[PDB]
Amino acid sequence: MNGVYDVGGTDGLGPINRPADEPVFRAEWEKVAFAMFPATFRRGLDEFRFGIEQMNPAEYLESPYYWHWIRTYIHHGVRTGKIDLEELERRTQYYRENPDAPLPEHEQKPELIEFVNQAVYGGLPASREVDRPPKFKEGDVVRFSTASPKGHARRARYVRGKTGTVVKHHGAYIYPDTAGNGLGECPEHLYTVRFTAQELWGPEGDPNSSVYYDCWEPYIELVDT
């Protein structure tokens, strides 16, 4: 989708706000939002992204980062009917008014801990084996598609229709244009492509700079080997 979230090359967002140091978690609520990433895929990572991309943009641009995770979880909850939105509003107000009230009693679950340690140190690899060989190879000159899907994809507006040089083939991976739209993994070959600053921005680009952007095979077509 052509969301404002796709901010690469956007002008006028202002200076960077960088404190000299900060903690990993700035508030206890951020730990709760974080723990919801692993609780989500236990919908995959791609669908998790798509729900952030459909946020209110003004909300997206200025909220604390982990609020994006709360939004994407509620987005999928109400859609799959697993989160009743009206109960959630009542609970919000309840905790607005009684912020120190306890959480609901629950059993701790050992398997959720083993899952956590497993995902963290073992990983959740997105690489997949496919039946077709790669179409492209190092040094091929390719053109990034000007398509503009309405659902989830990884086609930053600032590379669409630009021409780059294939730099590395990585194997095949989960394809976002199907995965993040609930249409399955449909694995595709993955490539790093190099775009000069001047191809990307015109004369306004730095004369000695390039951007490397990962492209899935359907994203690119041959111009020259």
Binding site: N17, T92, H106, E107, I113, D214
Partner: protein, 203 residues
């Protein structure tokens, strides 16, 4: 930036806290969240996984040229030689700072970061100011925000992680550190030096 429509930070914090506790109470009743699962996750990236891990990889590649070659061929496999890997670093490609080339890393679409070597990213990395400007004015961004003058002849390569492949910068070894110990050299490797927004510490 000034936005006359925006609530106070305190009011924003108070509203988020209530909405989060409310969602949490519902997920707990569904059985998919527990307080212990939350604390374990928080514990891991507060104390266990962090940029100290990536510094070990850097000092090994600095002091072991065969390892460095494997690091640059396949970052996941080489970091595994040090028992370092996992979530959001399943595919790692490390890239080398030279006298001719400087590397800087960004996720313009969201916030992708190599968690197993760096931990969770600082907030400025996940926010729109850095993400929007670095692919378009890398040289000035580095000067203005980080005090880092990259000479206009040096090529700046910006790596945008639009896939699960994660890019990590191997910073140049500082001058004046010949024969230093691995623990000594580690004090020079910063989180920022492996994002590429700063060099490793001087002296």
């Amino acid at each position: 930036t000034e936005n006359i429509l925006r609530k106070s930070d305190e009011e924003i914090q108070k509203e988020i806290t209530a909405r989060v506790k409310a969602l949490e109470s519902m997920l707990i009743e569904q059985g998919i969240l527990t307080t212990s699962m939350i604390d374990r996750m928080a514990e891991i990236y507060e104390n266990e996984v962090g940029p100290h891990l990536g510094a070990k990889v850097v000092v090994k590649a600095w002091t072991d040229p065969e390892f460095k070659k494997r690091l640059l061929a396949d970052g996941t496999e080489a970091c595994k030689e040090l028992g370092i890997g996992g979530l959001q670093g399943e595919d790692m490609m490390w890239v080398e700072n030279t006298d001719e080339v400087h590397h800087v890393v960004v996720c313009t679409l969201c916030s992708c970061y190599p968690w197993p070597v760096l931990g969770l990213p600082p907030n400025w990395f996940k926010e729109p100011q850095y993400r929007s400007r670095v692919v378009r004015e890398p040289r000035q961004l580095l000067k203005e925000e980080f005090g880092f003058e990259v000479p206009p002849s040096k090529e700046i390569k910006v790596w945008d992680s639009s896939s699960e492949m994660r890019f990590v910068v191997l910073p140049q070894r500082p001058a004046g550190t010949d024969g230093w110990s691995e623990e000594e050299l580690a004090t020079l490797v910063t989180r920022e030096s492996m994002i590429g927004v700063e060099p490793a510490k001087a002296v």
